[PDB]
């Protein structure tokens, strides 16, 4: 661990302040080669700061880098939904005939603005059943904070067969969207009638249901 | 001033991966380039650095089984890793990191799946997503199921639909195959989801009817 | 030197 980044996880409401720190076990090249990167899930990282404190192109003024020697800091004031991301410090090291880089472990930044979800359910397309396998899809739209999904088939809670996939926080409104899929064999699907997905946020549940015979 | 990674995206344990980074708009010997990787849900980790002058330096964990190479004729830098395990499944980036200088350049990344238990390359089956036949503004989607390796690209009407378009991260299924889904909020058009699987050069176009009713 | 390893 050349670069120790803290905290691992931080959180703020819109307009709040975030601080991320990076401690280096030795000096960076020229006491200068330290940069900060922003990464959103499923995208290449974006450089925010280089040479400790110089802002890159396309970087708002609410990002600020500072530090020296073995201590470096990134701050975000007036935090916005577009700032929800994972942040990494990256240091350059070496001598005249050795060279390397080290990344910090990363800091997840969550930006808070509460919204309750709506839920849709999608019966399997007619051509799925013939394949021997059917996947039912439940979507929880536009929500924060995180939710849990329960599947029920004729009142029986499903404990396997589920795949959940979440979109990163929306850069405009901070919200998530969730895709939950239940996969069954075609025999099993044709053996049951009522398929229900229940989305729970804190104590509130939202439910969406269909009957196989109706679709 | 861009780079792009290419290479075989499905490899087997015990095999090797070979990834090529091709530079555009400049010559690849003007700068030092790093290879970086990110395993699913993990952080970035540095593999090695090829200096502008052409010497390669490796992280300790990668030293023995990695080779970083440059071909200035072809304008490329190349990563080869041997003795692969499933632990090497990751997104691989070539990048001029720009820790201390104004130029930073990252490629889009290339997703390498290491498996022998997942099968061979497989194009996705694409299924429409529509509300149950039991009923103007409606969310539709497409389920892209059972492909290998990553990635797929999903557009709606070739990218001209954007409102409420959400494409969810793929999930590695228990079979080793991937699946993802994508939804769009529509309000009168034949809405078509266009799915491309570059590794098999497969392109699917599925028109999505407004409901599961058979009369559409 | 902008980076290490320049020799």
User: What domains appear along chain A, each with residue ranges and CATH number?
Assistant: 3-112 (2.60.40.10), 118-214 (2.60.40.10)
Strands across the sheet containing A71-76: A3-6, A18-24, A71-76, A63-68
Token pair 């995208």 in the structure block, residue: A43
End-to-end CA distance of chain A: 56
User: Which H or E run includes B69?
Assistant: strand B66-71
Nearest to B91 by CA among A126, A198, A161, A42: A42
A69: left (phi over 0), alpha (psi -120 to 50) or beta: left
Domain(s) of CATH 2.60.40.10: residues in chain B? 2-114, 125-208
Start-to-end CA span in chain B (Å)? 48
Q: Which residues of C touch A93 (CB under 8 A)?
A: 4
Q: Beta strand A54-55 with A46-50: parallel, antiparallel or unpaired?
A: antiparallel
Contact A125 B129 (CB under 8 A): yes
Which partners does chain B have (≥3 C-beta pairs < 8 Å)? A, C
Query: Taking a C-beta distance cutoff of 8 angstroms, is the pair A134, A128 a contact?
Result: yes
How far is residue B152's CA from residue A65's CA, in Å, rounded to a whole number? 37
Sole residue written with tokens 């380039």? B33
Question: CB distance from B103 to chain C under 8 Å?
Answer: no
Q: Which fold has domain B125-208?
A: Immunoglobulin-like (2.60.40)
Alpha carbon distance, N-terminus to C-terminus of chain C:
10
Both tokens of B7, joined, read 């290479």
**What chains are in contact with C, requiring at least 3 Cβ pairs below 8 Å?**
A, B
B145 and chain A in contact, CB less than 8 A: yes
d(CA B54, CA B70): 7
In sequence order, the 6+-apart residues with CB closer than 8 A to the CB of B82 are: B15, B16, B65
- Does the CB of C2 have a partner CB in chain B at under 8 Å? yes
At the fourth CATH level, which superfamily is domain B2-114?
Answer: Immunoglobulins (2.60.40.10)
CB contact burial A59-81 (16+ within 10 A = b; e otherwise) = beeebbbebeebebbbebeebbb
Find the CB nearest A41 among B169, B181, B212.
Answer: B169
Query: Quick one: tokens of B118?
Result: 């997942």
Helix (H) or strand (E) holding A92: strand A85-95
Determination technique for this entry: X-ray
């Amino acid at each position: 661990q050349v670069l120790t980044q803290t905290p691992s996880f931080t959180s703020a409401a819109v307009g709040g302040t975030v601080t991320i720190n990076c401690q280096s076990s030795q000096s960076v090249w020229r006491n200068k080669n330290l940069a900060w990167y922003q990464q959103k899930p499923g995208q290449p990282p974006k450089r925010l700061i280089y040479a400790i404190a110089t802002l890159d192109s396309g970087v708002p003024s609410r990002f600020s880098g500072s530090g020296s020697g073995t201590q470096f800091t990134l701050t975000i004031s007036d935090v916005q939904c577009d700032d929800a991301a994972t942040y990494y410090c990256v240091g350059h090291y070496g001598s005249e005939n050795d060279a390397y880089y080290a990344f910090g472990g990363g800091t997840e930044v969550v930006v808070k603005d509460p919204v309750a979800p709506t839920v849709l359910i999608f019966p399997p397309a007619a051509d799925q059943v013939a394949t021997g396998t059917v996947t039912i899809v439940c979507v929880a739209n536009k929500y924060f904070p995180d939710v849990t999904v329960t599947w029920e088939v004729d009142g029986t809670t499903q404990t396997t067969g589920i795949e959940n996939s979440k979109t990163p926080q929306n850069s405009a409104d901070c919200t998530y969207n969730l895709s939950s899929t239940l996969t069954l064999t075609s025999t099993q699907y044709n053996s049951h009638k009522e398929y229900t997905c229940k989305v729970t946020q804190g104590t509130t549940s939202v439910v969406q249901s269909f009957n196989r015979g109706d679709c | 001033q861009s780079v792009k990674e290419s290479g075989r995206g499905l490899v087997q344990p015990g095999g090797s991966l070979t990834l090529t980074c091709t530079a555009s708009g400049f010559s690849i010997d003007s700068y030092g380039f790093s290879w970086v990787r990110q395993a699913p849900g993990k952080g970035l980790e540095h593999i090695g650095y090829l200096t502008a002058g052409g010497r390669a330096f490796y992280a300790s964990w990668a030293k023995s089984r990695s080779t970083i190479t440059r071909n200035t004729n072809e304008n490329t830098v190349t990563l080869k890793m041997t003795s692969l395990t499933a632990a090497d499944t990751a997104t691989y980036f070539c990048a001029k990191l720009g820790s201390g200088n104004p130029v930073a350049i990252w490629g889009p990344g290339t997703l390498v799946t290491v498996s022998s238990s997942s099968g061979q390359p497989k194009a996705p089956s694409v299924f429409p997503l529509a509300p149950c036949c039991g009923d103007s503004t409606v969310t539709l989607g497409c389920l892209v199921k059972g492909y290998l390796p990553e990635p797929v690209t999903v557009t709606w009407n070739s990218g001209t639909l954007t409102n409420g378009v959400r494409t969810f991260p793929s999930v590695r299924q228990s079979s080793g195959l991937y699946s993802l889904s994508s939804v769009v909020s529509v309000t009168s058009q034949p809405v078509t989801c266009n799915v491309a699987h570059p590794a098999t050069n497969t392109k699917v176009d599925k028109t999505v009817a407004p409901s599961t009713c058979s009369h559409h | 030197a902008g980076x290490a390893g320049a020799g």
